Subunit: 251 residues, 4 copies
């Protein structure tokens, strides 16, 4: 139960972030949907508010320090606190290393890694006040732990998020701030639903051959894990990553 | 919510297992407490039954194949299924390697490793029937992932449990069986009580000095994690270990 | 270079252990080949001696405490010390967990895990003497770190060896003893050259497809690990001038499982 | 035996990189000393040339794409190939996350992570030619695997390097290119030598308390591990990281 808590989810206009925001709101949290896509952010907030929850849409480029600061402070002013941060905005750009654009490389690191750093820095200024505390969750991937070809930038970024979370777990403990990384496997999306006919079988072998059961991870799987971490009564799980992938990479 | 589910918890006359049995029963599971200490198992069962739950005590030396098979079959006949196995019974025997008796070594592997193997094998015969499925949770340790001196036998066995669980995740998938390993940090139980005199200085420094916050893990921390895994709606977390240790070893 | 050092390699009558013994001896170590197969152990020792090295064969069941203690003390009396222990004897027995024989389970843990414990403890009695020191290497597997179906006993044992080695690294430090685990991918030993036509027939696919897709599908390059790959890693660990690598495992698998 | 091989070591005007360059040269490789500090790079090269080896100094800001491309092409021009890349240049900047400068954050990412990416990409243009092959080694840290407070930027970067190396191992294999990450523990440097009297107690407790033996890692430890990887006869070790830390973090 998260009644009375406040959450900000970046990238929540779509996909995994959207489901996380809907389920945190369903659990009683007030939720700020932060996204580059301001229209989509407002659509999610207006869905939560029409269901009886409390939500705001926040226009936020997570690569832009001042926009991140302004958006996080806006959440704290609207809701009174920033108790849960889910750093989730992301994109994918594929190429082999020898033809990988350096501009693409930096954009990938800025969205995935700098966005996590910047939103964490802005949130901690609130969570640390009077040691109120907080939960900070980064959206990793099985690619935080394992590589695939053509994804050097993404894999590098998702690996780096583990390091940031592990430092935060150490620094944040004295202020009652916990850190975690959630690492989904392959989530079936509308784009995946178009590739399955295109690529062709593809499901169980090409896409999910590295799972134990050939089953896609769902946005519900991810959000339920986020809610469990967000509501956990102690700091016992701080610093840990959680692989939600149907057995693709086991630790 | 575990209404309609059946669970066997080995080692549940005491400590971590006892809390797991009580919390599983409060969630609506019928619970079999299986323990070398049959009187203690009966006492936990009586506590559950007096509170409105459903439980039985089972005599079970988990090193003894007949006792394991008889006990699991008893649960299945009493409750109709064996849906959740928590393999938790364990002891600690401390000595440097050069003074570690081979008798102690084998006893440690028999209780920790053979006990997990024997109880899993017996439970799978029930869980695999008509692919009913199941959840198998091994009680590991931060010592499944990291070593301490004087604990060669224990650390070896706790490391071995990860291997068994990861194989079960692969084998069990086609029968809807999941596997997990829970890895607590220090928890105040008789297993800890018996060590400290041999070794508040040992507690705050030697033990809790590995955590980020200086806090013992509680039996509630562990049981809440077991309940989360037990109720999870898909197999997305299968094969994974969960470190519940307040930041002692981060993966 | 290992001149003046003594090494004991268990399971070295054949395969990976045999190659480790030959390369340790070529580097200057006096090598004892400890194996259930006494003729095969004497054969490897004689191959070393004829090439100008120094070696003996030692009959040893690594599951038996008396045999291990007697054999290790024999090496110490023959060569003067026991500086390097390579715990390598193994066995594979496959079955799904729900039909895994407990007799076979106990045999798998006795050979892999008890063998490592017993030989380690016997060797420490010499290595700890006057804090002389030593290097203890366990032969693990990619299956020390990752699972495959039907191999519960093997995977559990190989995972456990990591734990033993990590404890030894902590306890052994004050006596100048280091520990490591070497983790090969698939190597073309006899038991494996048998697996390949057997798996081909059973899976109904070509032999090349068993190699490239089933056995080596998780490597980056489709290449078997060689006995030379493993032995050169053991040589490097054995001669390393400091304890900097103690407690670590080394995956020698052409990219199957990366840490 | 690296006779006839060519190597480039970034950051090799000083410290770990310098010892690596000296030992690669002593093993018979031609060595380019790439460093921001051109004075120091020329000095190491001159040390090598006076001892009978072959070396060049290369002024190279590893954060700058043009400087990296021009520098690596100069090595291939001078020596005929680029067979070994050691990506080693680094810097450390400490601060808690909530006070951390984004300017420092970006500098840390640029040197540690962008430098690895840019030097790798430039080297592959040469190593992939006719599948000649190559060895690419990133200098990580125990902080590639484990966190310390105040080092968020550094720990994040060093964790990210594992991801990049793991992708390179998969992509490079078809071209005979291997990747590794070498992870030194605490290396005693002149700066360390003036902190011990500032703080044989600070050594074994504050600095080396997390080692098993209280021994500093040496530059020789690191360079010997680099030489072993550089001469390995097969790709068997590709994608792996090597912890050279006297037991601080065990995998
Ligand atoms: N989909 C999967 O299979 C999968 C698997 C593992 C991990 N992940 C991770 O989960 C997270 C969410 O992924 P998704 O699949 O739901 O993606 P998505 O494309 O559905 O949603 C991504 C959202 O991020 C927003 N965004 C992009 N750049 C932004 C920026 N600069 N500032 C703010 N918002 C920005 C987009 O506008 C969009 O709303 C990502 O971090 C992704 O790497 C996804
Ligand atoms: N307490 C901790 O700090 C800690 C930390 C991490 C992991 N663990 C693990 O948690 C598990 C539970 O330990 P605990 O701390 O609750 O200890 P505990 O001593 O309170 O309970 C252990 C129980 O196991 C039973 N048992 C012992 N040998 C048995 C056998 N042969 N067959 C059946 N039952 C047997 C005992 O009778 C007892 O009821 C163990 O596996 C332990 O290794 C404990
Ligand atoms: N072959 C592979 O593909 C592979 C891959 C990774 C790891 N490994 C491991 O490497 C090691 C060697 O592998 P391998 O295939 O060369 O051989 P192996 O595992 O089949 O071992 C056979 C050898 O061990 C000896 N041996 C068996 N039981 C013994 C006992 N009780 N006491 C003493 N010696 C005994 C036999 O006489 C024989 O010489 C084993 O630990 C194995 O698990 C093998
Ligand atoms: N010293 C340790 O205890 C330790 C431990 C683990 C890892 N490491 C890593 O080892 C590597 C070497 O570190 P060190 O301790 O030898 O440090 P150092 O200070 O002795 O050497 C750093 C070198 O990098 C160069 N450099 C810095 N910025 C550069 C840039 N933009 N372009 C090119 N060259 C640049 C400097 O000119 C210098 O020669 C680093 O990656 C460091 O993170 C060091």
């Amino acid at each position: 139960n998260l009644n009375g808590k406040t959450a900000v989810v970046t990238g929540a206009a779509s996909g995994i972030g959207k489901e996380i925001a809907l389920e945190l709101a369903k659990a009683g949290a007030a939720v700020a949907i932060a996204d580059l896509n301001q229209d989509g952010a407002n659509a999610v907030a207006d869905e939560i508010n029409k269901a009886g929850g409390k939500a705001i849409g926040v226009a936020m480029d997570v690569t832009n320090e001042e926009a991140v600061n302004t958006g996080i402070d806006k959440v704290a002013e609207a809701f009174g606190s920033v108790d849960i941060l889910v750093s989730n905005a992301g994109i994918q750009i594929v190429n082999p290393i020898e033809n990988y654009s350096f501009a693409d490389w930096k954009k990938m690191q800025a969205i995935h890694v700098d966005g996590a750093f910047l939103t964490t820095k802005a949130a901690l200024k609130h969570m640390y006040k009077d040691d109120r505390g907080g939960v900070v969750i980064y959206m990793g991937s099985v690619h935080s732990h394992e590589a695939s070809p053509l994804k050097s930038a993404y894999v590098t970024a998702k690996h780096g998020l583990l390091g940031l979370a592990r430092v935060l777990a150490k620094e944040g403990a004295k202020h009652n701030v916990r850190s975690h990384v959630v690492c989904p496997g392959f989530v079936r999306t509308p784009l995946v639903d178009k590739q399955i006919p295109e690529q062709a079988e593809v499901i169980k072998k090409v896409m999910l051959g590295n799972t134990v059961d050939g089953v896609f991870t769902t946005v519900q799987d991810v959000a339920q894990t986020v809610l469990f971490l967000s509501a956990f009564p102690s700091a016992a799980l701080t610093g840990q990553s959680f692989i939600v992938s149907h057995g693709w990479f086991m630790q």
